[model samples]
Target: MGPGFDFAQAIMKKNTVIARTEKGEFTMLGVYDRVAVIPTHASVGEIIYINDVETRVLDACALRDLTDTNLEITIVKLDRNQKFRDIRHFLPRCEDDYNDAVLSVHTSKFPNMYIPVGQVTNYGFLNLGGTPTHRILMYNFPTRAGQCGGVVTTTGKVIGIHVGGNGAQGFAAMLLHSYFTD
Candidate 1:
């Protein structure tokens, strides 16, 4: 809701799905054949829905990653019998400094895909528990409550996932490539 982008065609809508919990529905990102990432805040309920396909959260110890910015995320396992298509592979942002980097925030709000354009204004790290985690400060990237798990991209490649926001500024946790691998 920060700044709307008309170039929706650039994003793969199928990879961004609505995850339904007992609490409510939120955005989820498909990352592998049968794996997806959801905001730890929304990873409640015994059974979760990936676009109507029933799924379950993986063990918390194995999937939880803590960030100092309160942008925690957890990986979920899709039902083996169900097929979720258009899984996306994420690319970590290489540069630390904010130059001409552009970001597109994709969320499955209102059962429709919404994309907002913005950029990273600053980057830093915070210590959570014993680990130091990366946090990206975003500007002009308006996001809402249920949109936390939405995928954030640059040049059509996933860089992170939306965590939260205040006013026109938001926070996203830089995704690690290992999240999708063994």
Candidate 2:
């Protein structure tokens, strides 16, 4: 119900991570220190970027050793919040000071096994999830000179975007099959 789109305020300013699936999609994740009454922006270590969604991996090459690093985070928006929960478990939550602002982080003491949990969309669980996957939020639009991409909701929230998602059930099936077969 309107004329245009806007992403100026939608992007989560906090540190972002990705989980790239063999199937060519990504699983996005974020880690922040919300272990107190507010986010404290603690230092964990080299921030992890999800490189293999199904495997729930971080680049072994990028890691210094078999070490888990803590990180400082800032603005954590809604989508990132949901993504974090889906990819990881809600071990615990606390509030702390982050960039002098208060934000909450939902994280576990240790990363859980890459799970097969589906996502919870506004309507319900998305038809596809739980495997090697891709996660993208497009930021380009209108190949022409003056056009743009956007999404407009009746709730007064609008976003003009282009994104793609596909399920990697094949790989997931293989993993499950292999475990049982052996």
Candidate 3:
């Protein structure tokens, strides 16, 4: 979409985190201040390894719709006892920003490589998102497996979580300003 945007390079610039689940291990977007938002596959009260450092998942919550397109977020709170420092999390964007410039990241073929696949194709709440919850956006291309929990960034800042493509285009859970406001 742009002449100079380096999607993979932008991803390498951010701190990387990981979650180990019964299914397998998966990468986390990053630590947003004190909270770490991950996929529901990651069990609650589990330990998340960030660069080999142990961090407890204090909480994990999600909406009923955990589908690929309308996937709800799994919010995890880091424990105070641990020293899991905060990494760069996606900044909340306004409506204009979401509508204009946005980027999605996914690692396919090459492991641990976050490649820029597409921009914000559309921004709105999926029908399954009851009561204005699970507001998400579908990016370009069909969904790629293991793309869930990938970073969706813009202007050198992360803005959402890649949820995967299902109905039409790929989906991402956009960061909400209210989380930081409160």
Candidate 4:
């Protein structure tokens, strides 16, 4: 049903800890043909905006800058109104220092290029589900066709998208910070 190999790691490094869990023996999850050096962008939209300004979207290696870059990512989830979602692109990289990696790279790289689309956006997210008390903030982007299931990461976090919008799109979380709920 799935590919072979799952790797788990536990160790001590520079006064810190890390872990990666899997069912059994398999190759490391993080073996890629081409590694993406993604950048964080200022997610800008019209009639909508969230705390994602401090948000991120990775830019790749060949592109030195994401001057006018646009990404429409969609994250995966098991149910409705749950904020944990993946990007359109997906990758399964094993974690070494997942937290530190996400925080550092996510904060630094994205801010380097992307900008707010029109202006400071003003809109919020709310659950349209039956039990509608839950909500999370999100913003949209203008992306073209043929880009989903790609991996969007701060460092080692695998944020993959599952759905589409705006002709072609991927979605993700408005991660205020890290939470173990996902």
Candidate 5:
């Protein structure tokens, strides 16, 4: 564990925001200053509420995997009216280990805050026919629909972004380093 690491403190509220689309609201993780990532399904041209201020999606692009059939993530830029905060750093996964402790901070059920702790159960490719196909880490935690874009961290460092999962198994995108450069 990192020195003096507090899971709650490590995940600052500023780094995450609620993205409201025509469909519904989901979690958005800030990776770089003023830039955040959300599920591709959450469409661009939506609104993000920050500190009671409305920020529009200035631009966005989809992050795709090798096959290019899946919509992995949507990198979005917010209006410059307000300053957005992002995660301080990311923790690359240790391929040799599959039991690392991790936490997912989201607002799926609680709209305010919901942090669930779980362990990496295994690593595999997520092939959802037409959704998106990418390497993902399976965790033994229950993640809901609105929590799709939540950030998954380990020892206070971001490891992945919560994508989708069943009630028993949770899935997180693994190629975070490709887009989360701060």
Candidate 6:
């Protein structure tokens, strides 16, 4: 009996961009899955500058490179690695709705603003006390503290992206679908 989409234009159409490096500003959402879906253990190669443009990070996969015995689900690979003829600019394919209701877009300290609206919880959860893996559990919402990468929609599409949480209990990365197949 709550949240029926349009969470403020789904946080401005999941385009909450920004990731200036040197251990500073970070809150780059929009991970419909494809075209550099990042969240690689703290800005891997680093340098995501945001809307104005600037990218460089072509490494990061916490799923042990796709199974062997590990599933921490983290994959950050950005532009500079350029290549996008089309595919609707990539992002749309990764909707596993365990019960529907998942929207995450963090960053609200004034850097770029974007907060709250994260639901999906307990559908195959994990995050043992701290820093453990196996995710898909989102709660109450509203994040900022230790906020890594964000983007986990539901009805509008984009299945998961936001990684790790504590306060409102959050986590995402569900729907790898092999980078959106072909």
Best candidate (score: TM-score): 5
> In lDDT terms, which candidate is top?
5
lDDT of every predicted structure (CA atoms): 0.56, 0.19, 0.55, 0.20, 0.63, 0.50
Predicted candidate 2 versus true structure: per-residue lDDT over 1-182, tens digit per residue: 11211121122223233322222222122322311110111112223223222222221221111233211111222212233312112211221111111111112211211111122122112222231222122211122111111111111211111122232211110001111111
Q: Indicate the worst ten consecutive residues by lDDT in candidate 3.
A: 101-110
Error of 2 at 5 (Å): 8.4
TM-score of every prediction relative to native: 0.69, 0.21, 0.66, 0.21, 0.77, 0.28
Candidate 1 residue lDDT tens string, 95-166: 333323333334344445555545565465544334444555464666566666666664435666666676
Model 5 lDDT vs. the true structure? Answer: 0.63
lDDT ranking from best to worst? 5, 1, 3, 6, 4, 2
Model 4: per-residue Cα lDDT over 87-109, one tens digit each: 21334332121221111111111
Off by over 4 Å in 5: 1-5, 46-52, 86-88, 91-98, 106-109, 112-116, 129-132
Cα deviation at 29, candidate 6, in Å, is 8.0
Q: lDDT for model 2, please.
A: 0.19
Off by over 4 Å in 6: 1-50, 62-72, 75-120, 125-133, 140-171, 174-182
Error of 5 at 113 (Å): 3.9
TM-score of 4: 0.21
**Model 2: residues with Cα > 4 Å off, grouped in runs:** 1-11, 25-27, 31-121, 125-182
Model 5, position 2: C-alpha lDDT score = 42
Model 3 regions lying over 4 Å from their true place: 1-13, 32-34, 41-43, 48-55, 63-71, 80-90, 93-110, 127-133
Count clashing pairs, candidate 4.
33
